[PDB]
Design a protein around this ligand. Structure first.
Ligand code: NA
Ligand code: NA
Length: 327
DNA sequence: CGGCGGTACTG
DNA sequence: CAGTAC
DNA sequence: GCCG
């Protein structure tokens, strides 16, 4: 598609990012939805009524849209706190969100050097600070492929039958990727067990993993690593790498979840809800059991889904290719 | 108005 | 319980 | 912020 409302969405994005770094996440979310709708719209917007006809745009958003349309400017931008660019700087540090960014700003910090010299830093934030510039850039998908191959080769050394796939924006076919998520399972349903620890050990020993952000997260039968890798060779940057090992029966739903996008996942959860189902990285399930007072007592029952297509089918949806899952 | 996932780790 | 990122 |  093509954006016919550029000067409008450019302005809205400024406002959206301001709300985000100030921690108004719900308001930012609503802006994101409206901003999407505007770009993928058959025409430039020429009236308030037309703006409101668009799902995701109500009175308040339409008002701003038409103000921009007519005057070329959005006044609310002129009343945006001067702190916003610094809050964004601080929250670009992996492990620091808006609360930490506020705290540092109130302490009078203004720069990364300020943070590096005088800020108290969590173990994760120190790594995120140390690799600030590397983590901010998106890598070419070619480099993501090499990263996936590195993980896959070290995994298949333990069991050649392991199935390994890079998810996220890479699987959605983007030219560049902010990170790499490598999802690992085994078709025999059992031989994924034991792999996670040995795999991280092997990647450690050969120098590929340079820092761990979360060395192990256990979520049901899924194991997740969040860390930092760097391919061999000179001129290589540090990159964010996640590794998730899952049982074969959850592979389709894990695959879907880690392929995303985040916005696509949110809309699929909403759709499942309408059908009295829930959708997680583990399973498509019937909705949980709620008692007399409306509180969840027990989990629902899993609807088995061997493949991503099975998930879409049970939801009464046409299959969507990963490249079509940005929204 | 409340929901817009729920979750693990960590403190 | 709250902060963060998935 | 928007939606029901
Ligand atoms: Na609307
Ligand atoms: Na951050």
């Amino acid at each position: 598609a093509t954006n016919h409302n550029l000067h409008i969405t450019e302005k809205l994005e400024v406002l959206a990012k301001a709300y985000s770094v100030q921690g108004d996440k719900w308001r930012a979310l609503g802006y994101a939805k409206a901003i999407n709708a505007l770009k993928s719209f058959h025409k430039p917007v020429t009236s308030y009524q037309e703006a409101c006809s668009i799902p995701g745009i109500g009175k308040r958003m339409a008002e701003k849209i038409i103000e921009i349309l007519e005057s070329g400017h959005l006044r609310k931008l002129d009343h945006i706190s001067e702190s916003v660019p610094v809050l964004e700087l601080f929250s670009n540090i992996w492990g620091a969100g808006t609360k930490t960014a506020q705290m540092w700003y109130q302490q009078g910090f203004r720069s990364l050097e300020d943070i590096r010299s005088q800020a108290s830093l969590t173990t994760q934030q120190a790594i995120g600070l140390k690799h600030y510039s590397d983590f901010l850039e998106r890598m070419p998908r070619e480099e993501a492929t090499e990263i996936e191959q590195t993980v896959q080769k070290a995994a298949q050394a333990f069991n050649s039958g392991l199935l390994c796939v890079a998810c996220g924006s890479y699987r959605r076919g983007k030219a560049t990727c902010g990170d790499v998520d490598v999802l690992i399972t085994h078709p025999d349903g059992r031989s994924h067990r034991g792999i996670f620890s040995r795999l991280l050990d092997s990647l450690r020993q050969e120098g590929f993993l340079t820092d761990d952000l979360v060395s192990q997260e256990e979520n049901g039968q899924q194991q997740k690593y969040l860390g930092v890798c760097r391919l061999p060779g000179p001129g290589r940057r540090h990159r964010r790498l996640d590794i998730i090992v899952v049982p074969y029966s959850e592979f389709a739903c894990a695959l879907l979840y880690f392929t995303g996008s985040a916005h696509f996942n949110r809309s699929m959860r909403a759709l499942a809800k309408t059908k009295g189902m829930s959708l997680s990285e583990h399973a498509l399930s019937t909705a949980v059991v709620r008692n007399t007072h409306g509180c969840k007592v027990g989990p629902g029952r899993v609807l088995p889904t061997p493949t991503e297509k099975d998930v879409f089918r049970l939801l009464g949806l046409p299959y969507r290719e990963p490249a079509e899952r940005d929204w």
